[PDB]
Amino acid sequence: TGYDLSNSVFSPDGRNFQVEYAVKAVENGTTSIGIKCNDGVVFAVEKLITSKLLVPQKNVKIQVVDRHIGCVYSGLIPDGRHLVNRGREEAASFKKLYKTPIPIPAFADRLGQYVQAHTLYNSVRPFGVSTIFGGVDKNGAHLYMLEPSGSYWGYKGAATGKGRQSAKAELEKLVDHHPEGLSAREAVKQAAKIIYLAHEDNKEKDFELEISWCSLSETNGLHKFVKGDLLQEAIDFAQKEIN
Amino acid sequence: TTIVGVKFNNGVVIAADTRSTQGPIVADKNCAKLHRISPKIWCAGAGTAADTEAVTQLIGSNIELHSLYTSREPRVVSALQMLKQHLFKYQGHIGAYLIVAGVDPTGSHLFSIHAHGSTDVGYYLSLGSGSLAAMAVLESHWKQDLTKEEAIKLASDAIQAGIWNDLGSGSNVDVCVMEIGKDAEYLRNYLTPNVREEKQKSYKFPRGTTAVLKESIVNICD
Amino acid sequence: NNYDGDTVTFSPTGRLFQVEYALEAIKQGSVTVGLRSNTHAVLVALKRNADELSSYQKKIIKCDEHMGLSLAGLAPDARVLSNYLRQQCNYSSLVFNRKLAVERAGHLLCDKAQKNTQSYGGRPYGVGLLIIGYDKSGAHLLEFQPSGNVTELYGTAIGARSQGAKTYLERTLDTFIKIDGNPDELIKAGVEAISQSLRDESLTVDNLSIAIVGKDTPFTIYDGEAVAKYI
Amino acid sequence: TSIMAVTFKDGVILGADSRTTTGAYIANRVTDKLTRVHDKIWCCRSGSAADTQAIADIVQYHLELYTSQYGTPSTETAASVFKELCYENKDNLTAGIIVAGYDDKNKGEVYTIPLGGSVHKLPYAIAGSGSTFIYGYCDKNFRENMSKEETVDFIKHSLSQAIKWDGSSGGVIRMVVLTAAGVERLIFYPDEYEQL
Amino acid sequence: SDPSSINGGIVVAMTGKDCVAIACDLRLGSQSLGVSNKFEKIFHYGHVFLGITGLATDVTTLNEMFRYKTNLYKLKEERAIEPETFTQLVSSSLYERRFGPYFVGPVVAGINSKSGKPFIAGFDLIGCIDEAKDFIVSGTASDQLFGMCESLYEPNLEPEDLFETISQALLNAADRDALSGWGAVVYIIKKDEVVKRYLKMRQD
Amino acid sequence: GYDRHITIFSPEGRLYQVEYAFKATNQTNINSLAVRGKDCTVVISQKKVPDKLLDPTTVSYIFCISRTIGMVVNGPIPDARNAALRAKAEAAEFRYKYGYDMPCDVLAKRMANLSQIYTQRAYMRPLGVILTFVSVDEELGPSIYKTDPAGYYVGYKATATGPKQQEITTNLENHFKKSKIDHINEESWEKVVEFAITHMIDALGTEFSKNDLEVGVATKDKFFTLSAENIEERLVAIAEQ
Amino acid sequence: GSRRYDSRTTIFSPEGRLYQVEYALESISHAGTAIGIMASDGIVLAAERKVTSTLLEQDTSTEKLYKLNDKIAVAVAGLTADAEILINTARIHAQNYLKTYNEDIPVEILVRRLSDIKQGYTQHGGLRPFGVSFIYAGYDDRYGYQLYTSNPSGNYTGWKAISVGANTSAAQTLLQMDYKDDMKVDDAIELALKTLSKTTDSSALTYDRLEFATIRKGANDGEVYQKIFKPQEIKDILVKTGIT
Amino acid sequence: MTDRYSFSLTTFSPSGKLGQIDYALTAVKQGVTSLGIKATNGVVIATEKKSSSPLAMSETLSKVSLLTPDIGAVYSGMGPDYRVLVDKSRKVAHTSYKRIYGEYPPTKLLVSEVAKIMQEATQSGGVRPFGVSLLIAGHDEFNGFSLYQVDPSGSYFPWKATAIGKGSVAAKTFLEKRWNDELELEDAIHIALLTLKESVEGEFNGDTIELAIIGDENPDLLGYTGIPTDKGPRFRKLTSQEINDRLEAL
Amino acid sequence: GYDRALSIFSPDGHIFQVEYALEAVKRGTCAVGVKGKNCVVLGCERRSTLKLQDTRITPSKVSKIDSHVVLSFSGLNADSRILIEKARVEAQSHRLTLEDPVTVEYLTRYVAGVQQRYTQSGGVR
Numbered sequence A: 001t002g003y004d005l006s007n008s009v010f011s012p013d014g015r016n017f018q019v020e021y022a023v024k025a026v027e028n029g030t031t032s033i034g035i036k037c038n039d040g041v042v043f044a045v046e047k048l049i050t051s052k053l054l055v056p057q058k059n060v061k062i063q064v065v066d067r068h069i070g071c072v073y074s075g076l077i078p079d080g081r082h083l084v085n086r087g088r089e090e091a092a093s094f095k096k097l098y099k100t101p102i103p104i105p106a107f108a109d110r111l112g113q114y115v116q117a118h119t120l121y122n123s124v125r126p127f128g129v130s131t132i133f134g135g136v137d138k139n140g141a142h143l144y145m146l147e148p149s150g151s152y153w154g155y156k157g158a159a160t161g162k163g164r165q166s167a168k169a170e171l172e173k174l175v176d177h178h179p180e181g182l183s184a185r186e187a188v189k190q191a192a193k194i195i196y197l198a199h200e201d202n203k204e205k206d207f208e209l210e211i212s213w214c215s216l217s218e219t220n221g222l223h224k225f226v227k228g229d230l231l232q233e234a235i236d237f238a239q240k241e242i243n
Numbered sequence B: 001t002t003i004v005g006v007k008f009n010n011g012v013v014i015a016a017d018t019r020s021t022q023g024p025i026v027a028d029k030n031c032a033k034l035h036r037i038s039p040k041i042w043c044a045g046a047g048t049a050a051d052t053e054a055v056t057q058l059i060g061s062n063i064e065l066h067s068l069y070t071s072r073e074p075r076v077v078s079a080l081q082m083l084k085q086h087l088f089k090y091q092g093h094i095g096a097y098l099i100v101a102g103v104d105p106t107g108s109h110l111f112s113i114h115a116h117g118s119t120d121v122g123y124y125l126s127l128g129s130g131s132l133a134a135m136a137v138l139e140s141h142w143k144q145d146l147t148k149e150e151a152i153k154l155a156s157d158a159i160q161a162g163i164w165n166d167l168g169s170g171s172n173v174d175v176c177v178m179e180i181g182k183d184a185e186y187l188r189n190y191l192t193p194n195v196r197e198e199k200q201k202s203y204k205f206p207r208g209t210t211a212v213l214k215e216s217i218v219n220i221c222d
Numbered sequence C: 001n002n003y004d005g006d007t008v009t010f011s012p013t014g015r016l017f018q019v020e021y022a023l024e025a026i027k028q029g030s031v032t033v034g035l036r037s038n039t040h041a042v043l044v045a046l047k048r049n050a051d052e053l054s055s056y057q058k059k060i061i062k063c064d065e066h067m068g069l070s071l072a073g074l075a076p077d078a079r080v081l082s083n084y085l086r087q088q089c090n091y092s093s094l095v096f097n098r099k100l101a102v103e104r105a106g107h108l109l110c111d112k113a114q115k116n117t118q119s120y121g122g123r124p125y126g127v128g129l130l131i132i133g134y135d136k137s138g139a140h141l142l143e144f145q146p147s148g149n150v151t152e153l154y155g156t157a158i159g160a161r162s163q164g165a166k167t168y169l170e171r172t173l174d175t176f177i178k179i180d181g182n183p184d185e186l187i188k189a190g191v192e193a194i195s196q197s198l199r200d201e202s203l204t205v206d207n208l209s210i211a212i213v214g215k216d217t218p219f220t221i222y223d224g225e226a227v228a229k230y231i
Numbered sequence D: 001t002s003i004m005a006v007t008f009k010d011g012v013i014l015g016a017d018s019r020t021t022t023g024a025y026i027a028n029r030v031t032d033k034l035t036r037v038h039d040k041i042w043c044c045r046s047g048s049a050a051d052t053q054a055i056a057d058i059v060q061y062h063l064e065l066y067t068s069q070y071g072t073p074s075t076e077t078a079a080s081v082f083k084e085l086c087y088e089n090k091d092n093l094t095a096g097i098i099v100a101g102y103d104d105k106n107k108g109e110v111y112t113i114p115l116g117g118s119v120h121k122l123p124y125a126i127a128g129s130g131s132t133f134i135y136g137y138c139d140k141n142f143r144e145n146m147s148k149e150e151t152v153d154f155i156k157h158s159l160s161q162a163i164k165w166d167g168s169s170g171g172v173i174r175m176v177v178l179t180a181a182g183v184e185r186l187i188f189y190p191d192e193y194e195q196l
Numbered sequence E: 001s002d003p004s005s006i007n008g009g010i011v012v013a014m015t016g017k018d019c020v021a022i023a024c025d026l027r028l029g030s031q032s033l034g035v036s037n038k039f040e041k042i043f044h045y046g047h048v049f050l051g052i053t054g055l056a057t058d059v060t061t062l063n064e065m066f067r068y069k070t071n072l073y074k075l076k077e078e079r080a081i082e083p084e085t086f087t088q089l090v091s092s093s094l095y096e097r098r099f100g101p102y103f104v105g106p107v108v109a110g111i112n113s114k115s116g117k118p119f120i121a122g123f124d125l126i127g128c129i130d131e132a133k134d135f136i137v138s139g140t141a142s143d144q145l146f147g148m149c150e151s152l153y154e155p156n157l158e159p160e161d162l163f164e165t166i167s168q169a170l171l172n173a174a175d176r177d178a179l180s181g182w183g184a185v186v187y188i189i190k191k192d193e194v195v196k197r198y199l200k201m202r203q204d
Numbered sequence F: 001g002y003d004r005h006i007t008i009f010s011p012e013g014r015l016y017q018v019e020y021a022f023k024a025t026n027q028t029n030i031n032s033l034a035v036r037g038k039d040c041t042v043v044i045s046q047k048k049v050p051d052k053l054l055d056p057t058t059v060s061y062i063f064c065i066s067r068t069i070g071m072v073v074n075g076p077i078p079d080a081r082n083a084a085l086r087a088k089a090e091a092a093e094f095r096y097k098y099g100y101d102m103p104c105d106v107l108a109k110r111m112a113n114l115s116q117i118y119t120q121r122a123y124m125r126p127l128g129v130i131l132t133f134v135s136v137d138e139e140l141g142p143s144i145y146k147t148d149p150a151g152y153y154v155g156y157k158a159t160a161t162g163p164k165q166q167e168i169t170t171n172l173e174n175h176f177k178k179s180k181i182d183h184i185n186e187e188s189w190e191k192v193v194e195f196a197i198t199h200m201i202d203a204l205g206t207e208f209s210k211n212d213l214e215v216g217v218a219t220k221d222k223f224f225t226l227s228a229e230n231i232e233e234r235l236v237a238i239a240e241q
Numbered sequence G: 001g002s003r004r005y006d007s008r009t010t011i012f013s014p015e016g017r018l019y020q021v022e023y024a025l026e027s028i029s030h031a032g033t034a035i036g037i038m039a040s041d042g043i044v045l046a047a048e049r050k051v052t053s054t055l056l057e058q059d060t061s062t063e064k065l066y067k068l069n070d071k072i073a074v075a076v077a078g079l080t081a082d083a084e085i086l087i088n089t090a091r092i093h094a095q096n097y098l099k100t101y102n103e104d105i106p107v108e109i110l111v112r113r114l115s116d117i118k119q120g121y122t123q124h125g126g127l128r129p130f131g132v133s134f135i136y137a138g139y140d141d142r143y144g145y146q147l148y149t150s151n152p153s154g155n156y157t158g159w160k161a162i163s164v165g166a167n168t169s170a171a172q173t174l175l176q177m178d179y180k181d182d183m184k185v186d187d188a189i190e191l192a193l194k195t196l197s198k199t200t201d202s203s204a205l206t207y208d209r210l211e212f213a214t215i216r217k218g219a220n221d222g223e224v225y226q227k228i229f230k231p232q233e234i235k236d237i238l239v240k241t242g243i244t
Numbered sequence H: 001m002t003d004r005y006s007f008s009l010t011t012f013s014p015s016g017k018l019g020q021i022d023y024a025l026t027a028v029k030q031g032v033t034s035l036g037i038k039a040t041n042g043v044v045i046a047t048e049k050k051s052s053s054p055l056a057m058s059e060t061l062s063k064v065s066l067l068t069p070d071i072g073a074v075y076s077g078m079g080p081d082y083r084v085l086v087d088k089s090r091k092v093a094h095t096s097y098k099r100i101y102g103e104y105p106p107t108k109l110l111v112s113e114v115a116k117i118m119q120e121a122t123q124s125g126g127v128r129p130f131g132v133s134l135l136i137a138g139h140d141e142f143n144g145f146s147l148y149q150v151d152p153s154g155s156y157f158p159w160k161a162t163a164i165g166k167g168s169v170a171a172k173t174f175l176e177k178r179w180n181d182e183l184e185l186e187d188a189i190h191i192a193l194l195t196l197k198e199s200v201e202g203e204f205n206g207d208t209i210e211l212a213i214i215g216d217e218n219p220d221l222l223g224y225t226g227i228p229t230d231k232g233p234r235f236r237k238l239t240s241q242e243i244n245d246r247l248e249a250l
Numbered sequence I: 001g002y003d004r005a006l007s008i009f010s011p012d013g014h015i016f017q018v019e020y021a022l023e024a025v026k027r028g029t030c031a032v033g034v035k036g037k038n039c040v041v042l043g044c045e046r047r048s049t050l051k052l053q054d055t056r057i058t059p060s061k062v063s064k065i066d067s068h069v070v071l072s073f074s075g076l077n078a079d080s081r082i083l084i085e086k087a088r089v090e091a092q093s094h095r096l097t098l099e100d101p102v103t104v105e106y107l108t109r110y111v112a113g114v115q116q117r118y119t120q121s122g123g124v125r
């Protein structure tokens, strides 16, 4: 054997074991989710409070690309930052040549091709993150999830990390109970609940909630963080549902 | 130089004179200005003679390789695009002015190319120092729906206008006919209206006329 | 085992062993403590010597007038990273006439360490850093690890026996955070914190190293007879 | 050269003469200066023939590749590509381009790109050597939301005058209509437009 | 400071009945100053003869370059290069320096060993081939040589007669050019013998 | 045994990495089919959406390479998209350089040559995909050309790819024995799509809803994919006969 | 990364030998035997073709003997493809020297440079060495007639008579026995053929399994001629010495 | 990132073998049979068209390829490796020869250039050898008709007649009996078909056999007229119908 | 370019590639140097398993680096040519810039520096 020692090597199955090993690092990380809604998208993430010495609200994990795209990830945090840095370069060159801000499907393939390229050679390591991202463009709202292999699809809802199965189950209920659609303000409240419910799989350390959103009506098509009264309202909604 | 291209019923014809010059001096009284890019795509060249020949040979080589790669007969627009992108890259420093003409699976085509990399389309075209003499004949006698024999006559008449009226052009008329569905026929020295008259005297010298200092057998063998 | 030959290889459980071995070099290094209030931020570092005839290895490095760090692990790697920080702080000043935010300083160190963990031939950095600074949003303390992970904190400690000081600061959190407009008292709290990581040895005049930055105080380092006040 | 693009109710119309000159000699009297960079995005070329031709080919290439990946490009996107070439190679280019196109959302749009490489979005645009003679006429006679027949007359009359006074302009008047209906090519001969 | 007319010199080639002739002057100068009266401008690579006029440094350089290339050709091909092929090699080599050219006017001459056909050719500095049945000229007295050849030449001349015609063409042309003369050499080339004669000419 | 990790010969003259790339082809568990009409070329492929949270409109293995060329992939989506982007770029560059639309068979050759390079050069791995290119070529007419990780390519009267490829292949073979011709003797493309779906139903033995299939059609001067409702209309026509 | 798959072609063994060089020499020992003999008035090159087939075109063939310039030739033993890479390099180097100095290259200078190329492949670059041994036969006006050999190590030495390839041990003993310093070319021709005829692995030595060449001053007055023997000329010289 | 394989992947083993070349030759042995025969007035090259599927159009896959108007090539072994070699061989004929001398290279020299390309894949960094053996037939004015074989090592040999691939050992024996120095071209085509029938198993007709000749000049295949010196390509690929005509009088 | 670190340390603090190069020297033919009051003498062994040699043209064991300095060696013969060539070039380069021939100490220091560079350069032995 030895087929799992080097990246870009096919095993006798037709599998790249190094990529599957990178998926394990992703499964080890904290929970993160994405919810598509009527006219936009909502993102949320679990931040583990390791110590009292961590400054609240001052270790931000959700990242913005351009002005209209949000990105969140689970796994190796530095690898995620590297991927966003590239995303920001790709989005910048698109806007430079073609004027219009990069469409979400167009942006999705730019990350996809870059991540896929890191499965082609033994001189590089695959990415240790699954990345949930999306935003609003000319054709409306788009939510995407990208994996270490370079694989990505569009989603109604998406989840990754240690509590992915719990969150996926809760997401599937929202798709069934709301066939006509879910509103943006509702999706923020639901996102809070789904992080609190998914925290049951990581309950030794208590946590800090962080939410962001893009909506055609509520945020005018731009990416913003949820803070203050609207954040506390979503926390209280989540607290009431666990009890 | 005088060069023309004329479209007709089932194809296209190009023609040229046969004079080559260095300044006011005639270097070659019977050069062939009709170059071959591909079997059914022919090229007529004016401007700097080394450039027109060099550029035509390069693109003809790359066209052959492309034809073999694609398993298809080469198209005139491929030669046009490759020529014009090459010339444009050199900003007019390659002084080639060409009339490109040929038949391919798409049909019959006639284009012109300039040293800076611009191109034109037309039913009748002319390039070179005798282009104005030729274009005058073309503008007077050209019509829509020309036959093969009519187009050859019109083309060679336009070249003759250059031969007689332009000092840069002279000697004979070359023609190449490219009809659809047939082989292209190259008509080297199609007209020879400038034959040198018998000289008044023979200048054969008596043997021994030239004074010699040294004789020696030269060794060419190994 | 078979998956620790280089940094480009993942283990079957999804671990990067070369990165974890680099993390081990920090644990071998001498203890250093960081803490802040709202007005000031303080670094306290225990220096180490080869023997009685040798000097004590300098642990604290200045990056700008408003920013600097303390190191634990491979000192040459700290020199490379601190030099990179000096350049980035300087680029921010020359081009934008802007003091580099302590948060952006961390983001830049993270991205530099990451590239070394994803390419063949290279190796991870073998050092951990505590960055303090005062910028437009007040006092700051950061913890850098060579995995790439950077974290903002009220207080912390890294190196050998760092868990003793880290527990003390976790108890003292409510007290030392409100030491505003008083440098000497914030240092005293830091000197008392590092003391919880000492075994057999005590804090002497050429052993202790303290640094401070704040509202009306540039990043300055104290060594020798200047630290005799706090013993 | 005389070229113009004009927005109207149903979309946009591009117009041009057919004369190409090498000094005072007319090298081509039936030139097509209206060129397709995409299905419903066309441009009018003025300046160096070689430069505009090379640029238009590169733009057609960029937009074909854009369409393969991201679907149909906007007219603004096409103008941006033209600009990027003209601006970054300003020292080696002599190209004055008018870009015109039809979206279904944005309807008809016109962008003009002069020598520098600057971009200017306008209701209508004129360019080329012969445009100097019709600034006064076009300003007085242009109206927004014109009909197709009204816009064709406006362009025909305008270019007719540009041709009359500019020696570098002449031949036939070519036009290209861009609407939801599709793409229509029009031609107008001297015997018609000269006696307007 | 015109590279093609600093050193001076001339070359001429002609065809006959089953033969060819190539001839050159011997002068090398620096503008008005005559320096050498032994500077031959005709070289040969097997049975293919090459004459080169123009800037003398480039004449020497190209001879050394074509010797190099025809030697490698013979090693790989296992045969001597023919005139038609060598002509194409010259054209290629000159055009390779299109925007920094050798300031020369080369002339190829020889008999194809397979077909027996007499062959001559000429080039500009930049590589353009000039093929001809009758004659080729090159150098600072090219105008003069063109006039002499066009009047004196007739087709199908015997080797002994062709020698007289080409010698008289060169000599009388050279005497009307200030930068040409100072001696002359004529090569008469038959299928399998080559005679080289040095001419007596006026030394001014 | 490092001769099984990189693309170098083994003692019996084999490239194991290439062979294992062929096995990655079936990792998605999807079957494709391609046939030619008089005027058109039809390609069909199964569409499987297991997760309820997925947006089914973004799940696709058919790609529009150029206006005239379409491509369906059998293999993982990252490599599929890698190959698609490259093919799109190659087709665009061909048009720019040579002044006419890249033919289907020429693009196939070019992508096949690229695949060959990954079998010879060590640092690059093969892509675990089989690319099926379709068009109505202006010189050769209806065309089907297929590429694999070995770098092999050939034209086809018809073809099939996937886990149950052999069953579909023999089903089509038997039809062309009977009809005595190289293509589907049919006027409209609608009925050629109906033929394709019918013969896939017979070979695989499964019934299809509107969301279980994915259809691509190549006509003169355009290639396009069908929507769910376009397929549903096509399924109704088969059922009523 | 790629470290895993590196053979490390340019390293030393614990005994201080170069693995790849030693193994390349093992390859060369199975190649057809080539002999060079230097006489007072010329040089002989003889070589045995590798197991010929009856349908091989013999007259228009070149396997063993190659011309570098008019004054220098080489006999090959090893991989032919590898030899041709090195031969074209040598042919070029000879023409560079002629272009620079207007004199034919001295034999040793050409040999040294070709050998220095082989040396480079054993010290750096991580590539396999050339699996080739040459016998160089040539003439210049400094040292006259000269025989050299080079091998994959890049080491070269001079010889009065020498063999490379298969059965060199046996061949070198036979040459050492019958060779003397006052020898003529025609005698050396006979010695070369007699040596191959005894060391051959074939049943009998025939014209169709041989390449032969001489470098004499047998041209007209003070000049060197290279003769690569034709099939019929090898047939006649084989009858004349009484082998067939 | 970047190609870190800057070292040889083909090395000498203790026994003096070059492993990867031997293994490449093994791949050639597995490949379908192809052959070549030289006549007095021409050369013939032939091979079986092994179809991957009956749905596949075997006309689109061309095993016998034109390299120049007077030179053709056929192979045994890995088809993709051959296809790229034909591309590189066609290009090198132009860049290293026709663009310099204004004429096509003679057979022996083009063969030499192909051999060089194959040798470099045996020594250069991060690459395996080509898994094919080529048979190259051609004509040129000064050497006449000729036939060459090229192996994965880069070695090449001239042949009166030979075969490579699956049933090469039996085919070479058959050719030794039938070959003489007075063979006309039609006689050589007849023998080529007889030799190939032995190695083929399934159908044997013009649709399963691929055969081309290097013979007389073909003015009809030139595409143009007017230049007397240009007389047309000596390479001609025999049609499906032209093969079946000769199979009746077999 | 070929980068591989061929000369590296081992657990016991030895660079094996450098030590194995010393074994190649030990295999080579003997060479001796003796310096007197007003001279230096270089003696060299030549192995006698090689008869039928041509001693006129065979490479001599002692090589002139300049007209006043000589170099003999033991080890791989092909390797020695590369050092001799570099030394000969540096000898002429020193005459060109300093206007004085090399000292024996300087020429040695140069050759030794070249030998050292090949013990910590990638891709080389």
Ligand SMILES: *[C@@H](CS(C)(=O)=O)[C@H](Cc1ccc(CN)cc1)NC(=O)CNC(=O)[C@H](CC(C)C)NC(=O)[C@H](Cc1ccccc1)N=[N+]=[N-]
Pocket: B001, B002, B019, B020, B021, B022, B023, B027, B031, B032, B033, B045, B046, B047, B048, B049, B050, B052, B053, B128, B129, B130, B168, E122, E123, E124, E125, E126, E128, E129, E130
């Ligand atoms: C007519 C062109 S014209 C007068 O501009 O209308 C012909 C066209 C032509 C002739 C011959 C062929 C055959 N390949 C193809 C086209 N062109 C000429 O008469 C132009 N003649 C030349 O360029 C001369 C050819 C020599 C073979 C006589 N060469 C020169 O005049 C060089 C040009 C040059 C010099 C320096 C730098 C660049 C170019 N003059 N000199 N010395």
Ligand SMILES: [Cl-]
Pocket: F109, F110, F113, F114, H087
């Ligand atoms: Cl390719």
